[PDB]
Amino acid sequence: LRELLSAKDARGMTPFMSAVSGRAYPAAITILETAQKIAKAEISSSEKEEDVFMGMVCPSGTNPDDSPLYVLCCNDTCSFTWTGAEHINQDIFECRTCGLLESLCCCTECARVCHKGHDCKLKRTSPTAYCDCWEKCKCKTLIAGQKSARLDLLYRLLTATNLVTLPNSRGEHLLLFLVQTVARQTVEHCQYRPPDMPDHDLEPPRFAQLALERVLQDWNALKSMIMFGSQENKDPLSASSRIGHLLPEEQVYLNQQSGTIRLDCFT
Amino acid sequence: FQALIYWIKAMNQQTTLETGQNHPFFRRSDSMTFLGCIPPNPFEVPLAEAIPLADQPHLLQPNARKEDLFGRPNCLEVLPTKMSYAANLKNVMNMQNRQKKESEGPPLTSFRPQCSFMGMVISHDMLLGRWRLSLELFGRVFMEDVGAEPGSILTELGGFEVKESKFRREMEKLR
Ligand SMILES: [Zn+2]
Ligand SMILES: [Zn+2]
Ligand SMILES: [Zn+2]
């Protein structure tokens, strides 16, 4: 089992990470419980319990954009599941890799998951639009999954792993990502109305608000967010993070300041 | 600033009144010895690096910074690190507190004054070393005005064009 759960598929994912990516939250739970058992069974080895566990859950050298705790939060439904073919004021993206050129578009969630790794750009046309991605492509955000299992899995991850401390692929700490999500949903969901084409007329997602409320109760998440931009909590991206190649004088100046742009943008 | 240097500079004039690598042949020369600086030693540093102009001759421009061409170089020893005004003022006062913490014998011709307070010894080269960029920037922006003071220290930061301003006057006078 340890080998089978630490083995990586053609996209680098363990079976656990695959269960999360596919919204099979009860399977992810089953495996995650089992992975803790396995790591706790091999305590007789000269490895630390954690190394094995992290190997099975989120292996070393994983691209941060695929870290499970982040992926679980990205797994929302396409707006179309609750707006249907009605036009609401929302953010929209073109996706040139897919021929979704400037007349066409997808909503934020499709751009984040259905078009992950493509050329996508924030579009400049009017925001009053539905999302073409369910019609033009094999849209992976149409399925909600089991909401109660999604929330249970989140709780478990927050206490099982240190993943809350990582920034995503744009330097956003998880909290700064969640609070922007809630602020965006607040505007989009207020446009919702009760009553070959995909299932529409579903109720909008409240997961980001629930997740934000729970994460904010974790000391580690909060400390990790507030200390962001300190010399210890070195932001990997867009933030003077490579310095050793400059001559020593400029280092002794440039080490002295500390960052707050993200902490201020959050607050 | 220009006036307060004048005072210390005058005081300093009252104060002053081999096959070694130290032999004058090996020492850095005109244009090369930066303000209050000590050489990047040419026997330890590559020629390519010691003099980017001697490395690349076409690098000379009329308005290039001298720092490029010859290679980039207690109250004065610690650099201006803090940006805040207030902390610098407070530190200045604390440093000042560190230093705080007929005539029989000499006739006037034997008077030995100096500047000794605020620092234990100030010589203007040190200060030209400390505020180097502010000075160079003043040495472009304020030259027409603060440079009109008699013997204004800004003209010593005068590049090519200052010398050329004298050149036309002298050559046309000779013509
Ligand atoms: Zn969509
Ligand atoms: Zn989609
Ligand atoms: Zn795409």
B81 lies within 8 A of chain A by CB: yes
Any known ligand binding at A173? no
Q: Evaluate the CA torsion angle A191, A177, A110, A78 in order and state its sign.
A: negative
Of B108, B106, B103, B76, the residue nearest B92 (C-alpha): B76
DSSP bridge pairs for B135: none
Transcribe B75-93 into DSSP letters.
TTTS------SHHHHHHHH
User: How many other C-beta atoms can be found within 10 angstroms of the C-beta atom of residue A2?
Assistant: 14
Q: Which two tokens stand for residue B163?
A: 């010398």
Q: Which two tokens stand for residue B41?
A: 């030693």
Cα A221 versus chain centre, distance: 15
Query: End-to-end CA distance of chain B, in Å?
Result: 39
The maximal CA–CA distance of chain A, rounded, in angstroms, is 67
In the reported structure, the alpha carbon of residue A14 is separated from the centroid of ligand 1 by a whole-number distance in angstroms of 27
Q: How far is B129 from chain A (nearest CA, A)?
A: 14
Contact indicator for A67, A185 with CB cutoff of 8 Å: no
Quote helix, strand, coil % in chain A, to nearest 5. 50, 5, 45
DSSP bridge pairs for A129: A88
In the reported structure, the alpha carbon of residue A129 is separated from the centroid of ligand 1 by a whole-number distance in angstroms of 10
Window A:187-246, CB contacts with B under 8 Å: none
Q: How far is A117 from chain B (nearest CA, A)?
A: 42
Spatial neighbors of A50 by CB under 8 A, at least 6 apart, are A39
CA-CA-CA-CA dihedral for B54, B55, B58, B60, to nearest 10: -50
Give the CA distances from residue B118 to residues A9, B75, B100, B135, B173, in Å, rounded to whole numbers and listed in that order. Answer: 70, 8, 9, 21, 47
- Pairing mode of beta strands A88-89, A128-129: antiparallel
Q: Reduce the secondary structure of A96-135 to three states and give it as a string.
A: HHHCECCCCCEEHHHHHHHCCCCCEEECCCCCEECCCHHH
Q: Which two tokens stand for residue B34?
A: 């930066």
A247 contacts in chain B (CB < 8 Å): 72
Q: Which amino acid is at B126?
A: M
Q: Which amino acid is at A48?
A: K
Window B:82-141, CB contacts with A under 8 Å: none
The experimental method, as deposited, was: cryo-EM
Spatial neighbors of A73 by CB under 8 A, at least 6 apart, are A154, A174, A177, A178, A181, A207, A208, A211
DSSP bridge pairs for A95: A100, A120
CA-CA-CA-CA dihedral for A175, A177, A180, A184, to nearest 10: -130
B72 contacts in chain A (CB < 8 Å): 247
Contact indicator for A39, A53 with CB cutoff of 8 Å: yes
B81 contacts in chain A (CB < 8 Å): 253, 256
- Phi and psi at A173, nearest 5°, equal -60, 150
Spatial neighbors of B66 by CB under 8 A, at least 6 apart, are B31, B34, B159
The maximal CA–CA distance of chain B, rounded, in angstroms, is 65
Q: Which two tokens stand for residue B92?
A: 């200045």
A253 contacts in chain B (CB < 8 Å): 81
